[PDB]
Structure 1
């Protein structure tokens, strides 16, 4: 039930919506698409229009990954059973 998540986003800098948008987009996208590959494409496309390009998001039920991301642009959260990781590099 997303007991532990890692949040690294700016607060009260007018970029507060990025954290809110990620939680809202993940819930809506995951239920309708119902595909691991499709969820990553939809989440990346919505974030790209709102906050510009160079955003990489990977969604897997169970996975281990290490990556370098721009500071305050990486958020990790669990949408229901599924786990979605989205970050901006470059």
Structure 2
């Protein structure tokens, strides 16, 4: 229902979905999931990212423009954004 945006052309927006859904099935604890998403996105694009996973949580963060992606993945919610 909510989809905060990022850069154009689906360089990044397209990548995150495809990766997240390998991630959700392949593990059970959030630890390996968030670690896996962050560990991939550091190698591909940028030097320091931040990721959150869960069914329910409040949050409010500072970041770099057009690098904030938030999406409801299945029952879970996944949050991702660069910083640093």
- In structure 1, list runs of 5 or more residues that go unmatched: 1-6
Superposed structure 1 runs of 4+ greater than 4 Å apart: 7-15
Q: CA RMSD in A?
A: 2.9
Structure-2-length-normalised TM-score: 0.85
Structure 1 residues 8 and 27, CA gap change in structure 2 (3 angstroms):
same
Alignment size in residue pairs = 84
1:49 deviates by 0.6
Structure-1-length-normalised TM-score: 0.80
- In structure 2, list runs of 5 or more residues that go unmatched: none
